[PDB]
Design an enzyme around this catalytic site. Sequence first.
Site, PDB file in Angstrom:
ATOM      1  N   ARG A  62      22.390  -1.221  10.060  1.00 46.73           N
ATOM      2  CA  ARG A  62      21.383  -2.019  10.752  1.00 46.73           C
ATOM      3  C   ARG A  62      22.061  -2.878  11.809  1.00 46.73           C
ATOM      4  NH1 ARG A  62      18.420  -0.016   6.822  1.00 46.73           N
ATOM      5  NH2 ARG A  62      19.209   1.978   7.638  1.00 46.73           N
TER       6      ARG A  62
ATOM      7  N   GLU B  55      10.975   2.855  -9.254  1.00 47.69           N
ATOM      8  CA  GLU B  55      11.013   3.496  -7.949  1.00 47.69           C
ATOM      9  C   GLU B  55      11.574   4.915  -7.974  1.00 47.69           C
ATOM     10  OE1 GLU B  55      13.095   1.163  -5.084  1.00 47.69           O
ATOM     11  OE2 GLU B  55      13.036   2.683  -3.500  1.00 47.69           O
TER      12      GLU B  55
ATOM     13  N   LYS C 199       6.955   1.834  -7.296  1.00 48.07           N
ATOM     14  CA  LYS C 199       7.331   1.960  -5.894  1.00 48.07           C
ATOM     15  C   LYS C 199       7.564   3.435  -5.614  1.00 48.07           C
ATOM     16  CE  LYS C 199      10.450   0.269  -2.353  1.00 48.07           C
ATOM     17  NZ  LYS C 199      11.214  -0.944  -1.948  1.00 48.07           N
TER      18      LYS C 199
ATOM     19  N   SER D  48       8.097   2.844   2.690  1.00 42.91           N
ATOM     20  CA  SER D  48       7.818   3.446   3.993  1.00 42.91           C
ATOM     21  C   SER D  48       8.579   4.746   4.241  1.00 42.91           C
ATOM     22  CB  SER D  48       8.111   2.440   5.113  1.00 42.91           C
ATOM     23  OG  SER D  48       9.449   2.537   5.564  1.00 42.91           O
ATOM     24  N   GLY D  49       9.702   4.908   3.547  1.00 43.07           N
ATOM     25  CA  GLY D  49      10.511   6.112   3.674  1.00 43.07           C
ATOM     26  C   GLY D  49      10.618   6.784   5.037  1.00 43.07           C
ATOM     27  N   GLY D  50      11.221   6.087   5.996  1.00 44.47           N
ATOM     28  CA  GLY D  50      11.395   6.661   7.321  1.00 44.47           C
ATOM     29  C   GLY D  50      10.171   6.677   8.220  1.00 44.47           C
TER      30      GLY D  50
ATOM     31  N   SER E  94       5.817  -2.293   0.074  1.00 42.58           N
ATOM     32  CA  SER E  94       7.141  -2.762  -0.318  1.00 42.58           C
ATOM     33  C   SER E  94       8.049  -2.150   0.742  1.00 42.58           C
ATOM     34  CB  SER E  94       7.526  -2.245  -1.702  1.00 42.58           C
ATOM     35  OG  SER E  94       8.858  -2.618  -2.021  1.00 42.58           O
TER      36      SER E  94
ATOM     37  N   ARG F 285      12.366  -1.317   6.570  1.00 44.63           N
ATOM     38  CA  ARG F 285      12.434  -1.001   7.992  1.00 44.63           C
ATOM     39  C   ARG F 285      11.073  -1.130   8.665  1.00 44.63           C
ATOM     40  NH1 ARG F 285      16.000   4.370   8.374  1.00 44.63           N
ATOM     41  NH2 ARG F 285      17.426   3.840  10.110  1.00 44.63           N
TER      42      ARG F 285
END
EC number: 4.1.2.13
Lengths: 343, 343, 343, 343
Positions: free
Chosen positions: D41, D186, D228, D270-272, D299, D302
């Site tokens: 990041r 998760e 999650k 959000s996974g990408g 949750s 990014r």
Amino acid sequence: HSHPALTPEQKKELSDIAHRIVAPGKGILAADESTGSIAKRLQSIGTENTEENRRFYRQLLLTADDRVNPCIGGVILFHETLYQKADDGRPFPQVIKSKGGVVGIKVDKGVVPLAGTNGETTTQGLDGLSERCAQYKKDGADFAAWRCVLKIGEHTPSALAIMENANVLARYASICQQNGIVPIVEPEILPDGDHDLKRCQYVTEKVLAAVYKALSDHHIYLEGTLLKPNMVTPGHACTQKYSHEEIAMATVTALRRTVPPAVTGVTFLSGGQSEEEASINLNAINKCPLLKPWALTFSYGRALQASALKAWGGKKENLKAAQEEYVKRALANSLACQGKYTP
Amino acid sequence: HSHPALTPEQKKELSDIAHRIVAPGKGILAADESTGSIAKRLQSIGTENTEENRRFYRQLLLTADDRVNPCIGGVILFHETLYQKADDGRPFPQVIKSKGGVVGIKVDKGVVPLAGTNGETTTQGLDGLSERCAQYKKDGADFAAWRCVLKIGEHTPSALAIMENANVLARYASICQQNGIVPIVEPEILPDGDHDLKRCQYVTEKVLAAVYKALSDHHIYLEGTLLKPNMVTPGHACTQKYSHEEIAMATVTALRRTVPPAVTGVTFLSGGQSEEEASINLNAINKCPLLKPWALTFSYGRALQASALKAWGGKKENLKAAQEEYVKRALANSLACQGKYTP
Amino acid sequence: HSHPALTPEQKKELSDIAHRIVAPGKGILAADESTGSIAKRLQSIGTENTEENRRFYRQLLLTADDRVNPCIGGVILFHETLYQKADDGRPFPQVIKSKGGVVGIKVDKGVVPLAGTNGETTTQGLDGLSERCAQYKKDGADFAAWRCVLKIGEHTPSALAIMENANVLARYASICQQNGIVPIVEPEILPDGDHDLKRCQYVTEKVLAAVYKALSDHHIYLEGTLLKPNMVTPGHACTQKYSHEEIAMATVTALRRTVPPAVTGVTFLSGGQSEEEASINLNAINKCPLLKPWALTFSYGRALQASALKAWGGKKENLKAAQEEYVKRALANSLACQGKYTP
Amino acid sequence: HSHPALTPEQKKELSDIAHRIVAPGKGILAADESTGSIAKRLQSIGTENTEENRRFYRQLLLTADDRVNPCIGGVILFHETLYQKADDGRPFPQVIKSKGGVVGIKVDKGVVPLAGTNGETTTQGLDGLSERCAQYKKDGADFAAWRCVLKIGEHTPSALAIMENANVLARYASICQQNGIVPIVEPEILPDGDHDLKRCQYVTEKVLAAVYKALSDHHIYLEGTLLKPNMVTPGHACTQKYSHEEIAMATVTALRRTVPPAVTGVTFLSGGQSEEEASINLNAINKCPLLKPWALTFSYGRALQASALKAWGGKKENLKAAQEEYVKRALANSLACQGKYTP
Ligand SMILES: O=C(COP(=O)(O)O)[C@@H](O)[C@H](O)[C@H](O)COP(=O)(O)O
Ligand SMILES: O=C(COP(=O)(O)O)[C@@H](O)[C@H](O)[C@H](O)COP(=O)(O)O
């Protein structure tokens, strides 16, 4: 689908190591007593639990005369010990090796309580186990030890206990084999309780069946493994008496219907059995008329050191007397794992 | 907990029967071809599929001279046949028995499609199986047959297929043992496909592991059981060629890591193998240097009748010529299951 | 992998049927008492167990005035009944249907003892179930019934019992959906014993969890299914007393943590509960403040016929008095499944 | 048997915490980027990966104006961060809390390769997790994070992957609840691949079913947990295009048939997915006409920081511009988790 976990070369290395440890007449010396475990030992003989004393007591066993050589195919050490040296500055792993023994290392981190159960547990130690095994391998270890504890009672071992413990043993075994370390699966079933021989054989059969099913699910190479199970016996508090032949038959039977012939060998744990008791039982087991497709040897600790520790008492002058008791038991158990014990 | 499914006397009866069937040099003749199965047989030799013809063809095999006696420890019959008689009014079960053979009976009701799978199946026949077994037992049967079919492909055998088929085999086995009938677990893995030896050994290992875990969950007496698995071989359409020693090693290996030594014996199925082919492979298997804690014999059908049926052609005058071919294969396979096969 | 067991059109048909049965205010009348079951009924009121009497008693219930129409979304029949006719030669399935009800059919063949267990069982009826379902579907049936029995005791329900019964319920459900029949999964847990509310909720939670895991493994369409579970209550012999709100909370809770919201509905079984008792409990359940993502209705038998059968006594002249008691309970339970019961 | 893992008081504490986190309009900010994660990041914006910079970037997010208060019910921190302070010497856990948010802590130690699989893994971090949770709880944490990674491919997720990952999530969850920490399960299924929506929904359904079965076996309190999961979407490389309603229906459906209503809430990852993309999908999901018995919130990491990090670029003078982008997304996702988004 077919996605090899091990190469032919890797399987050979593991199988080779496994057979070496349980070669005819050979057994294992369990000197992996942890911190709190060995502490009680040194305590029973008015001896300060100092690293130096531990280093001495261990050196005492690993340096016994060569009479023990053909009797010991492997010896398990605790982390500390694996990095200690003999008086001649010789690393312990080297002492063991020079005497023809394979060096083993306990990699588990103790049992943890299983929530929602009746005092049942599982064991930890999987975190960073891989890199740990890679290091241990570099430092002379060729096989590992991981103990899971199960106990017989009203509703135990529960389905959770059996399933969880069996799965963790497989994870441990899997990681071990990835680092050229022969994993010894140890699903110990405490002998505590007033249950009888039948109850024990039953639980052992059910537990052992779950263990190998898990090992299969995790794609573990059986030939490159060893099994450290409890012998089949009645509870310590059982009222009914049984003969050495009876527990020998119950043991071999429970093993015959659960342990695949591919398993290179079985190194029994003495589990609170007297030195003599454990030797006679191992002899009976090897005398059982039934067919045994795997080595039936020993992996004792107390049953191999009880007398020694006693003859030692902490006094350095007692070195010889102590080692003599050990060599005595080693010779006694080397015969037993051959069915030739004769006290 | 300990709630015995079998008594010591019941276990003895089952174990005794199991050993009898696979005694040294002895094998099994699979004459349980069902309705649609035997229909194709009689068809290949321009012969009307009449009950009388079936009765004749069966009598033809069960009455072969005594040379077959030491070769046949058991023969499986279809319901119809179990109630037919030889020309002398002698019940077939009696013919078999008089020749020292144990009578077996197929109790399954064929495979059924598994919904949500890729052409996979499971098999039925559990309904009223108990009373059926009690009857068959009374009518001379001592062991049963139940075939489960699995196949190798893209996503098969699926987890459902393996789990369901393994569970049903255990239910069947459980009910059998309750009625003094020795159950023969048959988890056949079709040889169809272009997969290789490795793929087959892998699937066999996974399937066999699931099978015995189920057997354990259902508390089945392994000693009172037999296993009728597929030999480990490449797909029928496989491009790569393998030797008899290679499939023998793959077979024994797959069995060594999955079949507990407690299992009294293994009676291989020929699964589309030529008479000669199946004999040589069985020989190689028994020649494998590895340790085999169970009997490795045969349970052939076509590999034992192919030539016979051909020499028969439906003509009664061909009785002798036909039986000679059968006795030929029986003698050939009696040696093989001993590792003494000639060419 | 993705190998559809059902097409979108097939899923729609099953989902549609399922919702119809449990539509608001609607419940199910269980008139599937088998041979030995209904025999005791007719016995309690000095009435010969003749096919004609059974046909009359059934006609008596299926022909009650239209007041029962909005209360009955479905009624389960036994094989015999499904092929009987009303006095006007009208097939029973037609009577039911004409009143807006869906016709259900019991397809299981009773429970069988599980060997090696403490009086535990599983149920049969899978053999030829497919063709049976195809026929029943043609003859007016749209949903099926299959009862599995479990019981609370020292070591029961055992892991085998739960696993086997859950797997069989899935096989049954799978075959049903393949033939456009909405399967109603019925994992009944006997209320027998002196256990308390907590023990029951615990076993129910564990059992229900295993049931849906099996349903998932067998790829069954939840939306095209219904659940016929036992309410959560203390053993019949329990010493401790509980309120209707307490069993209502225990019930909804046990369901909330095990039954996926996709399940179209839950049709409780009265399991030995008095007519009034079963109605009040169903009301409490629907009154529970917690969130219920599925219909919480009824599928009673005795709790819906007790009074009727009594008012009948076998006398034909008592037809009206008998039907009035039934309509009474149907109206009582139609409100309860809406949380509006008025004792 | 009934051996409570949690007391009524313990269940209340966990349930209370769980509901607080997913209260209406509230979501979770995932700021637990580990060492190698957050490193990339800071890299993307030419910024030295120093502890001070990390402390600043984190403070930047946790100190955004109160507009974010009603949008954030919880925020996950990495170990380091949990012990850092804001410029005013105020501990981060205190900053979060003062704004009405619950503090979460990632407790897993990353994924490890599963031997014998096709690039599959499981995750570690169970060793000494108990004492770790007891400490974190004391230091202001009320819920934990543990990520398991699964991926769709030829033979993945394999039965081992699903079974192992599901079991580890349960062990983790079990230990968490023992220390008053609400575990967030998760089971992420990577969106990598060219598979379609159907394949994803299928795998998600199978995976989720295994997850909750494990949770049940380990006796975990569902009400005191959160989920999650990945939204149901086609592979990143999928050729076929789908609408936001299509993935919303596939998502809710997959959840409806696997997630028990007892589960307090679902916090999607959000996974990408782009910031906008993840917001619209969350909105569609909450707009789905089907019945959702659990909170369907967010949750994100990014999808909540992308713009911020960019507007920051490392320059301290950009503090306001950066926080504005975050508050923007938080407000955007607070509406979405309510079905009121409106781009
Ligand atoms: O007869 C047999 C003898 O060996 P087993 O496999 O029964 O032991 C086998 O050869 C099988 O029946 C064979 O695959 C017949 O299949 P089919 O041509 O009818 O479609
Ligand atoms: O009739 C019933 C109606 O409710 P369901 O449980 O069928 O829904 C129940 O009351 C059961 O059949 C009852 O236990 C009968 O058992 P029985 O006295 O014959 O030994």
